[PDB]
Amino acid sequence: GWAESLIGLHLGKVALITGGSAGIGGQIGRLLALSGARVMLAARDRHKLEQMQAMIQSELAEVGYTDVEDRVHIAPGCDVSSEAQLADLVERTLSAFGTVDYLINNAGIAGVEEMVIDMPVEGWRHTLFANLISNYSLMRKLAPLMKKQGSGYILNVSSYFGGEKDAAIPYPNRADYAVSKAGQRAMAEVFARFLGPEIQINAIAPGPVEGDRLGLFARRARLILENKRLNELHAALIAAARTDERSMHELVELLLPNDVAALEQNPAAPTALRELARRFRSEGDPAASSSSALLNRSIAAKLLARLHNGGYVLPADIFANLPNPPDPFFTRAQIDREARKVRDGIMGMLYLQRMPTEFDVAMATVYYLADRNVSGETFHPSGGLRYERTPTGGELFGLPSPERLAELVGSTVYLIGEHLTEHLNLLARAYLERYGARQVVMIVETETGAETMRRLLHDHVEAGRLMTIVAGDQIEAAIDQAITRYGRPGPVVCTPFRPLPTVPLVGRKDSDWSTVLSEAEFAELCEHQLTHHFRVARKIALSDGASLALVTPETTATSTTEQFALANFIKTTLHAFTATIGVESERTAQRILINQVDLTRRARAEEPRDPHERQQELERFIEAVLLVTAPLPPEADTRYAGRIHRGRAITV
């Protein structure tokens, strides 16, 4: 009865739905089948997938379809993070049904669920493989057949937290997930012109749905409280260490009695730690041992990891004798209070004051799939949400205040890059010659890049003002070398080592697509243009850098059209990272200012066309980098100014 609108809507279509055993994906597969499509449901777990297949087949028979076993197939054991398994899934689907009409890129994992500074690099990479690279990989395998037959549809199941065309949505503690969701949207935005007219590509971006948060909530609330304690201790130690003569080792030794009141009362402890202990005693529940003990062994291990990953020298056994605080570390009251805060916060987003169901979101999506006139769009099948957003793409700016520029005198600057040699030369010379920096550490990828920069900067090399380090694929170890030999950085500028590739993004209708950007090449693009910046941001924040500008690839008036597309894919996707880590840093009292400077524009017509305009552009680049990297003087770092100067992106 409720399905009469659906029956026939997609008759004759073949759909592949990843993550099709449950959630939105299972409902999309169910409703597509009811609408008349033959569906392949892919998932990890065989049992749930068999149950979903049986449910759908039974419903099809109830409404009158025959031979229902021919209309719903399953592909169990399918881990979309594995390229080999994606190849197997496509072969299985084409063997069952022939050419796929609709690719529903629905599979997604939650990811690492940590702040960037607690996020293992391999965990970030895994999230990108599962949630983003898999979407390109399946498109790359199925679009040739779609184009050959003259029609197809790619739908990437993104999220409200993937942002929108000209604004990022910060998702603290979920930067890997947010980047993956933004990339799914950006893929549709930039590939639409290449895939048209035969193939539509769009994203859906539902907000919260009933069930997407899957005792467990009490456990997550406790982790929230444990990570707040970690953040407060870490920020106080980092702050104390930069203005105290004692080493980080000696500062951590002040925590070893694990006694809040004793630390507060210790007249020789740094003010930052004494004030923190006072807050723990005041803001803490008297029945919670966290009000009288500084940490537990779990927090201590995670804190030690942060310190080691920031290059601070401490024995691995420093916390081996830490007194264990008695249970409960946080009270049930504190934990339930935090859990209600999380829940009420989500429900408070909803203008309509009602949580959408997976079924309703899937229904809206199945209707939307009938629309043949949309491509490159993000459809919100549920929406109406109060949430913070960070507009991107401001182009009108000037230099920072003289007060901020004065903070650069005597500073240690790190510049990271290789292919943008002109930009790196101009930046090093600006910091050293105009703004009185003490030294620039130039961190390149290869010996050839190092020699190129040493020759361009020969005068500063000879004077001891320009040091070079060759990082290869070990940027964190290279930063550690810089810390040990030249000192911790103030301002840092991170440019990509590699240029963008110049291969086709789609193939001709009758071709084998052999020259089109491969699945491995797309993964390499993400490594060099997204993971590069994440690794630097993670390491620099852990190492107490004062500021960090993340710089995207350069487009010019002569860049190929494919370079424009990939550059804008990267620009939009990186905005999600910048906005998220900016808010993470702000909310955890980290002083680092992280922002993005875009050398990519949306349209060739905006680019400089003669040497004068090119000189104007390069001057704008220097001004933009100074605007985001000049530290805030003490008389200026208010809550108000702090929000302004983090998480933003400006376009040169």
Q: 449 a known binding residue?
A: no
Can you list the positions of beta strands (E) in 25-122? Answer: 38-42, 72-75, 102-105
Alpha carbon distance 550, 648 (integer Å): 10
Please check whether residue 608 is in contact with residue 383, taking contact to mean a CB–CB distance below 8 angstroms: no
Q: 213 a known binding residue?
A: yes
Instruction: Pick between residue 190 and residue 457 the one whose CB is nearest to its own copies.
Output: 190
Q: 278 a known binding residue?
A: no
Q: Considering CB distances under 5 to 8 angstroms, the limit depending on partner class, which of Mg ion, its own copies, none binds residue 382?
A: its own copies
Instruction: Pick between residue 167 and residue 262 the one whose CB is nearest to its own copies.
Output: 167
Q: Could you say which residues in the range 200-229 bind its own copies, by CB under 8 A?
A: 200
364 contacts its own copies (rule: CB under 8 A) = yes
Instruction: Pick between residue 412 and residue 559 the one whose CB is nearest to its own copies.
Output: 559
Number of C-beta neighbours around residue 641 at 10 A: 11
Q: 512 a known binding residue?
A: no
Q: 24 a known binding residue?
A: yes
Q: Could you say which residues in the range 146-165 bind its own copies, by CB under 8 A?
A: 164-165
Gaps in the chain following residue numbers (C to N > 2.5 A): 214
Q: Could you say which residues in the range 404-433 bind its own copies, by CB under 8 A?
A: none
Please check whether residue 153 is in contact with residue 200, taking contact to mean a CB–CB distance below 8 angstroms: yes
Residue range at the interface with its own copies (CB under 8 A); choices 425-433, 440-448, 476-484, 610-618: 610-618
Q: 580 a known binding residue?
A: no
Tokens of 606: 């905006």
Q: Considering CB distances under 5 to 8 angstroms, the limit depending on partner class, which of its own copies, Mg ion, none binds residue 281?
A: none
Q: Could you say which residues in the range 589-608 bind its own copies, by CB under 8 A?
A: 595, 602-603, 606-608
Number of C-beta neighbours around residue 319 at 10 A: 20
CA 150 to chain centre: 35
Give the DSSP H/E element, type plus range, for residue 593: strand 593-598
The minimum distance between CB 322 and its own copies, in angstroms, equals 38
Q: Could you say which residues in the range 497-556 bind Mg ion, by CB under 5 A?
A: 556
197 contacts its own copies (rule: CB under 8 A) = yes
Instruction: Pick between residue 145 and residue 426 the one whose CB is nearest to Mg ion.
Output: 426
Q: Could you say which residues in the range 4-33 bind its own copies, by CB under 8 A?
A: 4-9
Alpha carbon distance 192, 201 (integer Å): 6
The minimum distance between CB 348 and its own copies, in angstroms, equals 11
Alpha carbon distance 136, 519 (integer Å): 7
Please check whether residue 152 is in contact with residue 198, taking contact to mean a CB–CB distance below 8 angstroms: yes
Tokens of 644: 């302004």
356 contacts its own copies (rule: CB under 8 A) = yes
Q: Considering CB distances under 5 to 8 angstroms, the limit depending on partner class, which of Mg ion, its own copies, none binds residue 384?
A: its own copies
Q: Which of 70, 283, 395, 447 binds its own copies (CB under 8 A)?
A: 395
Q: Rounded to whole angstroms, what are the CA distances from 72 to 8, 67, 401, 507, 589? A: 16, 10, 64, 31, 52
648 contacts its own copies (rule: CB under 8 A) = yes
Residue range at the interface with Mg ion (CB under 5 A); choices 17-25, 453-461, 524-532, 604-612: 604-612
Alpha carbon distance 298, 300 (integer Å): 5
Helix, strand, or coil (residue 351): coil
Q: 44 a known binding residue?
A: yes
Tokens of 115: 């702040």
Alpha carbon distance 303, 227 (integer Å): 10
Q: 181 a known binding residue?
A: yes
Instruction: Pick between residue 331 and residue 595 the one whose CB is nearest to its own copies.
Output: 595
Q: 209 a known binding residue?
A: yes
Q: 48 a known binding residue?
A: yes
Q: Considering CB distances under 5 to 8 angstroms, the limit depending on partner class, which of its own copies, Mg ion, none binds residue 628?
A: its own copies
Q: Tell me the one-letter amino acid at 515.
A: T
Instruction: Pick between residue 439 and residue 629 the one whose CB is nearest to its own copies.
Output: 629
Tokens of 345: 């916060």
Q: Could you say which residues in the range 322-351 bind its own copies, by CB under 8 A?
A: 350-351
Q: 386 a known binding residue?
A: no
Q: Tell me the one-letter amino acid at 315.
A: P
Alpha carbon distance 103, 478 (integer Å): 42
The minimum distance between CB 97 and its own copies, in angstroms, equals 23
Tokens of 499: 């240029």
Give the chain's largest Cα–Cα span: 84
Tokens of 46: 């065989």
Q: Tell me the one-letter amino acid at 429.
A: R
Q: Considering CB distances under 5 to 8 angstroms, the limit depending on partner class, which of its own copies, Mg ion, none binds residue 521?
A: none
Kindly determine how many residues on this chain lie close enough to bind its own copies according to the rule CB under 8 A. 83
The minimum distance between CB 351 and its own copies, in angstroms, equals 4
The minimum distance between CB 567 and its own copies, in angstroms, equals 16
Helix, strand, or coil (residue 493): strand
- For residue 259, give the DSSP letter: -
Helix, strand, or coil (residue 549): strand
Q: Which of 196, 211, 345, 472 binds its own copies (CB under 8 A)?
A: 196
Q: Which residues are annotated as a binding site for Mg(2+)?
A: 241, 244, 555, 585, 590, 607, 617
| Residues in contact with Mg ion by the rule CB under 5 A | 556, 607
Binding-site residues for NADP(+), in ranges, read 19, 21-22, 24, 44-45, 48, 79-80, 106, 177, 181, 209, 213
